[PDB]
Ligand binder design. Structure first.
Ligand code: CL
Ligand code: CL
Ligand code: CL
Ligand code: CL
Ligand code: FE2
Ligand code: FE2
Ligand code: FE2
Ligand code: FE2
Ligand code: FE2
Ligand code: FE2
Ligand code: FE2
Ligand code: FE2
Ligand code: FE2
Ligand code: FE2
Ligand code: FE2
Ligand code: FE2
Ligand code: MG
Ligand code: MG
Ligand code: MG
Ligand code: MG
Ligand code: MG
Ligand code: MG
Ligand code: MG
Ligand code: MG
Ligand code: MG
Ligand code: MG
Ligand code: MG
Ligand code: MG
Lengths: 161, 161, 160, 161, 161, 160, 160, 160, 161, 161, 160, 160
């Protein structure tokens, strides 16, 4: 049948190249945050090492799930993610993480900055993504929420009051 | 009480008949997708049968949770879902699923089309739902995301590259 | 060596009549599932929560049941039809009403529909048993499970 | 780096005092709903006591997770929650819950009203929150959905049909 | 079209008084077995105490699950179980368990005999139950299997070469 | 250097009076378990499901209770008797009636049964405490759990 | 037969004084929970994460505690009052400050407030024990749990 | 009063014919398990992973099956033989070939193996049922599970 | 309203030196028991090896949980535990566990005696502990119950008829 | 930059025929052990039946996990396992398990001897395997540890004083 | 007493060469993880789902591996570098292509890249072993795990 | 045909030198466990909670370690001694001090204790490896886990 469509080939929602590009921006920063998070996780030393060591893993977990979500959202919308090391290094907006052992206080500031850069990328892209596909913008909202929570849980260590 | 409201009867948000109708459209297609998913799950044969057999169940799981979510969202907003077989058959927009055993390749195309029809119903209704109640549109966004992911995981089997 | 010679050993195949009997069971289990969910959402009134929850348990059982029967058909070279049009046209269950319904009414309605489903299974049981006792064993589980659901639901309306 | 930002101090999104105030409104009503939920949970008596006793705990669970989510969302955005008893009592919009044992029927009406007041606070604040930060409005949508579901699961007990 | 039945009061399967009485016989022996299993579990002493102590609890779990199953099957089929202590003591076919402590060797023989007696009751009513209701006989088959396995696990302690 | 030089250090032995006191608790816990299941099966009427479920929770608690008490007796070298004949002959709980009973009747009956069981524990509490505080602590656990079950069950019939 | 005659056996009822004592414990446990959550969100500075997490554990315990006490009141026919107005007006705990607070300050503040809560429980303990040792046993668990939380929190600020 | 007065109540003993019938089932289940693992390791080609995984599920089912049958024999005082020499000498299943095999070949080979195993169970079913319905019920479970595995495996090669 | 106290430094319950010394006595015997339980667990041989091997690990788990509980209760009450090996060896009241392999029968008697001794220490300090702090005495009650149950589970292997 | 290799077909480690034959020897004894362990598990009777019955299943689980590990290691290294019944019977070094029921004491000695033989095969090929592939030898080390632990847990039943 | 005198006992320290060797292993494990995820998202064609899933399992293993090696470096006073620039500049793995790729191609590509990763581990193995066998034991686990992944992936493309 | 014809195949026996070497490892693992709990209870000051928690993880690892070593000794028919007197008399670990200790002091003390324990394992490693590689593999596991704990603990005091 009464209301049954009779088409044999019904196509899905396809992302525009601009939309694909916007998600690619989010993906590389998520991946760069994950790699920097692990680097910090390994090389942090000094007062309250353990809390930071542990919290940094939780951040990485969240960042990894985020990258997988974004990349697979691209696939669903017929876009093609690039999460390769050369691409991430050449295109990330995140300030470089320093080499060697870094103190807990330094790591807190460094990582907070890098989380904030990552969230800023999502925020800058948010409205263009929403205008085309609110469902994908809803995924961005989850990323913003979780990442900004991580920033709070990490930065609070250095707060002097 | 200081700031306490003094009303004994405070009423909740009620859905308009248009809104109720829009959710009913989503519900029957979700249910029809679930029934067609099981039909495909049982009758698929041929190369890569198992992967498809398994993925089709995952689709059904998602579609069933979606229908329950939508129907109960209607109840919360004082609307009345109808998920009975006669209603679903008479009102679904999904193209009919064929009888008998179907090859893996045929099932992939058939189900992808039917997922896409279901998502299209949600997409067509999305803006009217959002305008009245953003919370319900947020539920739709979850459905769009999950269903379009299922389409990608299923259709990729037939992609020639 | 007692090893067999054949390179192609075939499995048990069901008769058309056998397939037809399981199809009868299948459509009534599916119908019961859909009616179960309908009642689950639309029940209101005294002791709403208990019935709301129990009906979800009835649906779970019915859905497991339909999958089991349809896949039994597949194992025996029969082809199940669980599509909405077929279910609607061939189910023996009394139609479940639309709209909100009282707990008391939902109890009576659902009990009747569970019983109709059990009746289908019971009336194909012997013919199924005669051909394949292992399938009849599957039917026995459904009879037990559904009749238990009937008891758990109908007891709400029992007086003294 | 090639695209790497060179800033050492990148700041996060900060909530305006208006935004902070709006979340504080949601927080105190969530907390007051939790406290009233427990009061009802303990003191409800009469026909269908158990179902209500159990459902009221589920409501409290949801309300508690909601308050923690909102308060921590404030922290992330550099706002400062106040969930202390004096503040909650002096600023909640929820009508007072009565003392002593109350019948199941009375508790159903009382709690439904109080859930509805809580949701109304979220709904009244929703658009201002969305305009500043869609991610936080997405959190509100989850609260609206869950709370309105609780209202349906509780109020249906008293529905005469 | 429509194969739909038109009756509004379709009745369930009702057991005959004889059938009910046969399941009642099974029920009381299963309960008696549970009580005796617990008695032995507490009061066994001697070589290999722990194994028998533990195995006896597994017997009791099986027997308890069994009695609940049979009792509820009675209820489903409109029969009325009597599992009260006075009835169990007055009607069980199981020989009494002796008082005070018993050796491991004696407990093995005693409990094995009581399992045998319990299975014997189930086997005695099996054909009559099967004739009326194959589904209930199937439940009996499970009890027979499970109980005879317990008998083997317990009795094998005393079997020599 | 602080090590004791006995080879056979004996443990705490319960007196036979203590054993009999725990024996009183044990039979009433077992009787409650048996009556709880009878109610669980045979309850019918308004709010069946809630009572059906709550009665199983009570039985779970009472079954754990009787195991704890019997094993506490064994730990202190007393010997429990939880056999059917003994339970029926020595329990202080009023007999549970035969046949199906309404939810309202089952609420009143079971509450009385729980209260009789708690009373037995309260009656022996101080004599048990005087000999062995640790055992009285176990009794305190039972008192708390049983009285909670009494409250959760009786509330169905309370009118305000 | 040792079976009792009564059809209506009543349970233990608490005195008004007893109910009042548990109410005192209830409001301080609730206050501690709310203050615990406040501190949990608003703590900042050195070793933030450890205290953030520990304070959530303190809240969990306090919430379990309040539910346990309030439901104990219900079991014994007493009526709990856990509403925000009542809690604010009748709690003995020093007010917890608004706004962000250093880890060191939060440690001192929360320790003091845990101790005030333990003090309430300790000062009603004997009067509760004299009437109902099973309730006093519940109080013992709270004393142990909260005093353990006090140790785990305060140790952050301990010097040498 | 209804209590039996024997001290040595004997249980149900299986006849030696029954034992041998279950012995036939046992060796084919064990052979299937061994051949299932060989296929699991040595399968290669298009859709390797699915078959690799499904073959392990089949082996799981067959391993549980042989334990169930051997222990059922023991329960009825029969004595199982699942030793390698016995299995190889008395199994009715066609030998599995050596070396790596394509997924298509493995599908055909394993399906034939499953079908031969089910045939053994179907051959002895009625003689087993005549002596002990409960054991035949176990056979029904095996028939259902094995034929399902046959369907899940063979479907990879079906062309429509 | 206000019943609020106004002190900013409310002190916790401090144990007397005598009380601390009494819990220290319990602690060392619990640790000694754990060490001896492990020794027996490794070194027992003979009839019914496995049961005792397994039961001894359950004893050790209980004793370890016990020592941690007592030690931490000391800390909570401002006392300082000493669970170091030298102290445990120099101050435990438990008779030494013999070296090398011991028969199952001997291990049963040996360990039972050592549990009895451990419980005896707890019973000796019980009243003095109860007089100062009923809450700590309650923890002792749990140790008494648990340890005496272990004693029964172990010793019953050697009890005859 | 760049240390990247430029080959498009990089080969994996291939085992020599001798290496493959050595793992095949381990495989058949592990399978034979599993089959014999199950035989004993079913057919053991007498004092301490239950413990041995249970311990034998733990042996079988270990041996089964072992054979799968060795077989798959063969596959990874391009060798081809033969775990067929005829091959296992014709090539195993394990002495045959006797038929029918055996006493607990006999099963202990019999199974201990068969574990010893299985470990002996693994120890005989260990150095030759280590010389070619240390990673496979490491897998052998795990089998040696696990099997010799099982031997101790089983054999200790028969060890006296 | 056999107790040592020192108040400061130092742990095993790795040589610069040792640290360098583990760094080589680290960057290739990280590269493999990133390439694994790339393939996981971008694979299309026949048997997509199996490879999609297996590649996620390869990534899980590689990520556990890199964490293990980097933390082993930290334990031995070496300093890991897992940053994207360093990984890209110093990895020995052939570059994985951008864009969609067929299952067959992804199988070949990933197998080659797994093998390149295993080769790095194998070529530092002896030098690592000579200095610290416990670290070489960790390398053995990676060799086993990755070579198992290579088998599970490459078997899709194997003919006859 | 390949079957061995001995009836008493003996297993691998450890030499007494090997046994004593594992005995050295065992006492230091037990001492570490005991000292770990002392630190766990008595640590106070800045970052108490982290150290309190990490010290329990170390004890968990060391307790599992000593069980593994003692049971490995038993497997090879050696006989362990983990009694208090033996441990105190033969351990090589420096005595842990009495009384409360600051987190900083506890970090230094425990790290030294871990390092002394690892040193014992490293000292006996090659003699153990020469007789039985499988046991040396167990030692490798201990070395890895203990040194990781050393790194996770010491890092609290590291200044850069
Ligand atoms: Cl933590
Ligand atoms: Cl899969
Ligand atoms: Cl419920
Ligand atoms: Cl066991
Ligand atoms: Fe993924
Ligand atoms: Fe639902
Ligand atoms: Fe299925
Ligand atoms: Fe939180
Ligand atoms: Fe039940
Ligand atoms: Fe027990
Ligand atoms: Fe509660
Ligand atoms: Fe088994
Ligand atoms: Fe602890
Ligand atoms: Fe496998
Ligand atoms: Fe890590
Ligand atoms: Fe152990
Ligand atoms: Mg910390
Ligand atoms: Mg959302
Ligand atoms: Mg949104
Ligand atoms: Mg596949
Ligand atoms: Mg049957
Ligand atoms: Mg059956
Ligand atoms: Mg209810
Ligand atoms: Mg035993
Ligand atoms: Mg007490
Ligand atoms: Mg207590
Ligand atoms: Mg090694
Ligand atoms: Mg290793």
């Amino acid at each position: 049948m009464s209301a049954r469509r009779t088409e044999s080939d019904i196509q899905g929602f396809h992302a525009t190249p601009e939309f694909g590009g916007n998600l690619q921006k989010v993906l590389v920063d998520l991946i760069e945050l994950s790699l920097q998070g692990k680097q910090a996780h390994w090389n942090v030393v000094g007062s309250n090492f353990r809390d930071l060591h542990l919290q940094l893993d939780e951040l990485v977990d969240f960042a990894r799930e985020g990258s997988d979500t974004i990349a697979e959202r691209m696939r669903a919308l017929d876009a093609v993610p690039d999460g390769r090391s050369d691409t991430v290094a050449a295109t990330t907006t995140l300030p470089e993480f320093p080499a060697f052992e870094r103190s807990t206080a330094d790591v807190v500031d460094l990582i907070t900055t890098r989380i904030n850069a990552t969230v800023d990328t999502i925020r800058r892209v948010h409205d263009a993504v929403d205008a085309e596909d609110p469902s994908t913008a809803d995924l961005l909202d989850g990323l913003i929420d979780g990442l900004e929570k991580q920033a709070w849980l990490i930065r609070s260590e250095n707060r002097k009051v």
